[PDB]
Design a protein around this nucleic acid. Structure first.
Ligand SMILES: [Mg+2]
Ligand SMILES: [Mg+2]
Ligand SMILES: [Mg+2]
Ligand SMILES: [Mg+2]
Ligand SMILES: [Mg+2]
Ligand SMILES: [Mg+2]
Ligand SMILES: [Mg+2]
Ligand SMILES: [Mg+2]
Ligand SMILES: [Mg+2]
Ligand SMILES: [Mg+2]
Ligand SMILES: [Mg+2]
Ligand SMILES: [Mg+2]
Ligand SMILES: [Mg+2]
Ligand SMILES: [Mg+2]
Ligand SMILES: [Mg+2]
Ligand SMILES: [Mg+2]
Lengths: 118, 186, 134, 51, 125, 147
RNA sequence: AAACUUUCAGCAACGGAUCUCUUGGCUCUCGCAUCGAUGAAGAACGCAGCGAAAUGCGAUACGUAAUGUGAAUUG
RNA sequence: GAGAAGCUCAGACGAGUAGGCAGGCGUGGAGGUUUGUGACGAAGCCUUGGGCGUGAGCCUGGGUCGAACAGCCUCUAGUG
RNA sequence: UUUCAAUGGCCCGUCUUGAAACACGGACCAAGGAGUCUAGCAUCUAUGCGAGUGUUUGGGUGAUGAAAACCCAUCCGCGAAAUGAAAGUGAAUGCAGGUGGGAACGCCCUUGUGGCGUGCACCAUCGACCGACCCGGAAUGGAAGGGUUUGAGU
RNA sequence: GUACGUGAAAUUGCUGAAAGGGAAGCAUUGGAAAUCAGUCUUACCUGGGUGAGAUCAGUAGUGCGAGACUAUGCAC
């Protein structure tokens, strides 16, 4: 949770997804027998590989050094009582406005940071 | 670049059992500790065999145990036999001697006959208490190549192995290529 | 009589009502059982295994209740297995000292004094009045 | 020696009675989640109707 | 739990038998609870509704209204109650249907057959 | 189950493991085991020698019941008797000797593998090998033949 | 500088994916044995206050007798 | 203590078609479990906002919407 | 995020020695769309039991509610014996043998990669034993004696 | 609003933004413009100012030896 470095912030888009709407952006390994991308010719897009993996100490951490724990109710927030300096509460999208208020209050009581407050 | 040729790179051995038996996991836990905190080759032998598959851990019968521990120049008189595997009975041995055996499993008949003859049966954790380094122990194994598949492995011209045949008799692979009167023999 | 505590952990290390496991962050696990002060899924902190174990829960409206497991003769009697001592209306200095005495100075779970005090501290911090900022 | 692992019997009003039963030997059987899962996987298929 | 081999818990069959019920079957399906005073008087919990019966609405926007049953629209499983209407665009008043299960009968249109139905159902006159 | 199958791993790999050059065509060397004498000979002659041709006499309408004769060796003879009978006679000196009727244990011939303890026993069998009979007689017992 | 072309977003179209549903299908099991020259199966033409397709029916024609229910039908 | 399936110290190494193996991601349905989410808005969809993962993917703000739906351990397949 | 500048970047899929090809498919988008299930066989793994193993051909608690669970007898399959075309015959000289290597254990050194004694598994090897075959070989039987051989044996 | 639940994509109109000398798209790096997040110095500890208060360390007593706890009082 100190000095968080990302080896890369660009997302690795699928080859030719910029040219055909039928080709989604989500990454696919090119397997063509002539593929210039698979062969890594200069000037082509990069492919995901294990060398891009981030430091094990800072992996998964948000910029503030915390990791965003999803919470669906008050009891999920109570799970983060002792882990106040390592986990932040992320309130689920399908939690009602009433329950969301009770969650925000419980997190504030425990000193748990909430990523999506408001 | 570096010119490295890599043949024995990844070790080929099991580092843990494939079994999900929780009690086998407890025995491994015991013998991981014993093999690490002692200088005994016996404990490393037990730990390694606790990982092995069923086919690599053949059974042994009480007859073989009785024979192996009763040789003329033995001195294996009052020592505990240990096998990481199943101890079966041999009903052909009409009178069982007094034996001390430590094993993973005992067949119901093997266990009853060992006890009735005044002997004793131990699990491997009981063995660890009695001989924490395996001192004055006879470590034994069953016959690895007694299983059916080894009748067939290596079959080929003039190898004298067993063929894979659906049935046995004349008309089932005893003709051309198996005798001189039919072209050639093997 | 006893079913082994090692055996119980093997059964419940990945399957129990009190374990909340998520695949995020590479696989985190939380333990929610009442007699687990640390809140982490491990054999030594699980009250379901250990003959001696402690838990610190919140007591309404102030203070904490110290939960402890009685002598293992009650292992088969769940009604007599858990002891719940209400340490409430004491100050923070008084509360931590009693927890340390009951758990540590008795030799019960000396390994769990620090975690228990920290857990009681956090519960007490959660119960304080809210200085709401209008 | 004498194990004496008895189990108490409770009356219909919740009070423990004076009668006990020795703990049946089956309660000392090995507890095997791997075996139980394998058997349960098979047995739970045996009510299925073909489609 | 049901145990009879002659009873179906199939959702498909139950829904088909309800929405495909013939006219005489739909009469029993459109039953209403009797009022507390009527339950004691006749020892009967509920009856198939009937035209010219007196009810009060117990659920919905029209809860608390009272009136005769002007018609029993069985094709729609609906009751039409007197003076329970709504205004159309052109000022005409359109009757508003209410489910039989959502009213309670406060006065029965007793007649020879209805009297026979009370005694047959174990009730009193 | 399908979830753990190799087919699931080959999704996105165009040739499904069967090669781009040679492919996964319909039967490219014929159906079944056809061709053992011609283009499959190098397999048949290596792994199934003796496959082709005839050996021996035919026997029309073979009926296996008159040929029924499972065998038991001497080393199993005392295992056919109950535990109480073994304790009463085996190793003791008695005026009567136990009768082991091998036919009621499901055997038609007594063979001679193994050894016998030194107690008399009467072995009732349809058939017996020569060496089996000699070892029974050395133990003080006898063979009595039955039908 | 516009117009024009191109991309993105909002809004509006075009289109009918998606999601949820389901008096339908499919499959299994259990039970049963009953067509016709006393004219069947099938076909045609007709029958309702306002009815063409379906259901039903046959000049006694969305039916007569008989039995049960017991106030509807409904556009 | 550090899910002993854990913890800790160190060194070397990293092209890949056809092909092989492993560990993962996602989908429909089944058992178990989670005082699980939900008309005070489930699912779905849009997005000129945010976050996580090398990646498969995942979480979230705002908009739209109207009745169901999800996490964890297992089972299963007409599963990308 | 958009755009600009500088530098790089040919159209993917495919068969191919070789595709940017003046080789073929591909105007666009949605939804659908291809290693399955079954009778076997083989290796490997897990589980149960083990000289045995396999309750589901059947029968029972059974009527209640029962396509499940659970229980129960005789057979039978595979395995516990091979060999021979067959008629047939059918597995211990010995500690169920000897030799070499060898796991594990014990003892001696004296700090070596030690010597000594048992020797599991496995492999190589010399024998013995059973069947077939080839011998001599003193009406029917083939006992002792043999063999360079032979068997998917002990 | 019956051309009716939700209402995707291709494709289209309007509005806004931006770019454009014989394609466009992409990658790297920054400029420019637009837009997003830090809520910090919260907690805990001590000192300083005043304030009121059932008042705290050792003890007395209520499971024999030692240790923790609550509870009646004193210690004011
Ligand atoms: Mg990234
Ligand atoms: Mg191909
Ligand atoms: Mg070719
Ligand atoms: Mg590589
Ligand atoms: Mg499906
Ligand atoms: Mg929603
Ligand atoms: Mg878009
Ligand atoms: Mg990352
Ligand atoms: Mg498919
Ligand atoms: Mg260039
Ligand atoms: Mg090629
Ligand atoms: Mg090409
Ligand atoms: Mg070509
Ligand atoms: Mg072509
Ligand atoms: Mg074309
Ligand atoms: Mg599709």
């Amino acid at each position: 949770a100190v000095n968080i470095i990302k080896k890369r912030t660009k997302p690795f888009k699928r080859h030719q997804s910029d040219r055909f709407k039928r080709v989604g952006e989500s990454w696919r390994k090119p397997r063509g027998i002539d593929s210039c991308v698979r062969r890594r010719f200069r000037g082509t897009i990069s492919m995901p590989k294990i060398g891009y993996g981030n430091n094990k100490k800072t992996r998964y951490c948000m910029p503030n050094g915390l990791k965003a724990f999803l919470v669906r109710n008050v009891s999920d927030v109570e799970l983060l009582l002792m882990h106040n300096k390592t986990y932040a509460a992320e309130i689920a999208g399908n939690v009602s406005a009433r329950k969301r208020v009770e969650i925000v209050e419980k997190a504030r009581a425990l000193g748990v940071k909430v990523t999506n407050a408001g | 670049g570096i010119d490295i040729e890599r043949h024995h790179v990844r070790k080929s051995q099991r580092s843990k059992p494939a079994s999900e038996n929780v009690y086998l996991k407890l025995l491994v836990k015991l013998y991981r500790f014993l093999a690490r905190r002692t200088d005994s080759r016996f404990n490393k032998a037990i730990l390694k065999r606790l990982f092995q598959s069923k086919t690599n851990r053949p059974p042994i019968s009480i007859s073989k145990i009785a024979a192996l521990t009763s040789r003329k120049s033995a001195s294996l008189e009052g020592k505990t036999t240990v096998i990481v595997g199943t101890v079966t009975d041999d009903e052909r041995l009409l009178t069982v001697p007094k034996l001390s055996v430590a094993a993973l499993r005992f067949t119901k008949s093997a266990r009853a006959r060992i006890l009735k003859a005044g002997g004793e049966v131990l699990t491997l954790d009981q063995l660890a208490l009695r001989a924490p380094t395996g001192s004055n122990t006879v470590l034994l194994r069953g016959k690895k190549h007694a299983r059916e598949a080894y009748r067939h492995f290596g079959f080929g011209p003039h190898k004298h192995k067993a063929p894979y045949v659906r049935s046995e008799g004349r008309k089932f692979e005893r003709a051309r290529g198996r005798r001189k009167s039919r072209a050639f023999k093997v | 009589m006893s079913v082994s505590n090692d055996l119980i952990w093997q059964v419940i290390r990945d399957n129990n009502r009190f374990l909340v496991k998520r695949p995020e962050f590479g696989g985190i696990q939380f333990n929610r059982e009442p007699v687990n002060v640390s809140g982490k899924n491990a054999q030594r902190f699980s009250g379901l295994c250990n003959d001696k174990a402690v838990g610190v829960q919140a007591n309404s409206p102030r203070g904490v209740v110290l939960i402890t497991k009685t002598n293992p003769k009650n292992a088969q009697k769940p009604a007599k297995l858990f002891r719940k001592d209400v340490i409430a209306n004491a100050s923070s200095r008084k509360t931590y000292k009693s927890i340390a005495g009951r758990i540590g100075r008795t030799g019960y779970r000396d390994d769990l004094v620090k975690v228990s005090v920290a857990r009681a501290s956090a519960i007490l911090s959660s119960q304080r009045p809210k200085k709401t900022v209008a | 020696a004498a194990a004496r692992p008895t189990v108490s019997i409770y009356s219909k009003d919740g009070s423990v009675s004076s009668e006990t039963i020795a703990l049946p030997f089956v309660f000392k059987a090995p507890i095997r989640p791997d075996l139980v899962r394998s058997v349960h996987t098979a047995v739970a298929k045996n009510k299925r109707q073909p489609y | 739990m049901k145990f009879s081999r002659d009873v179906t818990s199939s959702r498909r069959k139950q829904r088909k038998a309800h929405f495909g019920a013939p006219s005489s079957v739909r009469r029993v399906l459109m039953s209403a609870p009797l009022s507390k005073e009527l339950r004691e008087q006749y020892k009967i919990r509920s009856l198939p509704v009937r035209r010219d019966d007196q009810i009060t609405v117990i659920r919905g926007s029209n809860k608390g209204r009272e009136g005769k049953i002007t018609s029993v629209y069985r094709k729609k499983f609906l009751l039409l109650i007197e003076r329970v209407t709504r205004e159309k665009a052109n000022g005409a008043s359109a009757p508003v249907g209410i489910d039989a299960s959502k009213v309670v009968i406060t006065k029965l249109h007793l007649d020879k057959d209805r009297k026979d139905l009370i005694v047959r159902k174990g009730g009193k006159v | 189950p399908t979830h753990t199958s190799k087919t699931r791993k080959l999704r996105g790999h165009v040739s499904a493991g069967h090669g781009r050059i040679g492919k996964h065509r319909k039967h490219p060397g014929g159906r079944g085991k056809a061709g053992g004498l011609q283009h499959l000979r190098s397999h048949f002659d290596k792994y199934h020698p003796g496959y082709f041709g005839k050996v021996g006499m035919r026997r029309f309408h073979l009926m296996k019941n008159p040929l029924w004769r499972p065998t038991v060796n001497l080393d199993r003879l005392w295992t056919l008797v109950p535990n109480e009978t073994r304790e009463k006679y085996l190793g003791k000196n008695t005026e009567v000797a136990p009768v082991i009727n091998v036919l009621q244990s499901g055997y038609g011939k007594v063979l001679g593998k193994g050894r016998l303890p030194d107690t008399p026993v009467i072995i009732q069998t349809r058939y017996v090998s020569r060496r089996a009979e000699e070892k029974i007689k050395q133990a003080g017992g006898v063979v009595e033949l039955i039908a």
